[PDB]
Amino acid sequence: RHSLGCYFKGINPTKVPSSDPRTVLKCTLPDVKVNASWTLEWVVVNLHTSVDVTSYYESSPNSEPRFLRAILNFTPMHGLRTKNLLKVKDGFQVDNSTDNGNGGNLYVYPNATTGSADSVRCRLRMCPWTSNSKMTAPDEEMLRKMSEVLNLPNYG
Incomplete structure (x- = not known):
């Protein structure tokens, strides 16, 4: 797709009350109605790593951001990585269901360190798209509509 340049932001996840033994960590995604996709990567500060999987969302001029898909982090798309990525068995299961409605959220197991869970x-x-190959950046309209993300803290 015709990328107009991707943006890298940091968001503090929240814990969702549930009877499930596992803790549900949700990443806020602003309601942006533009032709753009969003990729989530779950990062653990205390372990200095991230979970081996990426979560994808998609929106449109008419449609709201919704969970598109989830793909295991075989290879990085922005340089090199080759780091000790976290596995499901380590107590880190990202919801990859489109039927649950909570796809993208991270399930934290009691087997996992709770100190690292808090970290x-x-x-x-955020990767906005277009159809004009001559474009290398989004316009004023898109920037305003994406302002809910653009005004987030930077993290990449």
Whole structure:
């Protein structure tokens, strides 16, 4: 797709009350109605790493941001990585269901260190699209509509 340049933001996730033994960490995604996609990466500060999986959202001029898909982090798309990524068995299961409605959220197991659980943070990549290959950046309208993300703290 015709990328207009991606933005990298940091979001503090919140804990969602649930009867489930596992803790639900949700990453806030602003209601932006533009032709753009968002990629989430769950990062653990205390471990200095991230969970081996990316979560994708998609919106449009008419449609609201919704969970698109989730893909395991085989290879980085922005340079090199090759870091000790966290596995499901480590107590880190990202919801990859489109039926649950909570896709993208991270399930933290009691087997996982709770100190590191509290150090979990959401890395947001916003990649707006177009159809004009001559464009290398979004216009005023898009920037205003994406301002809910653009005015977030930077983290990349």
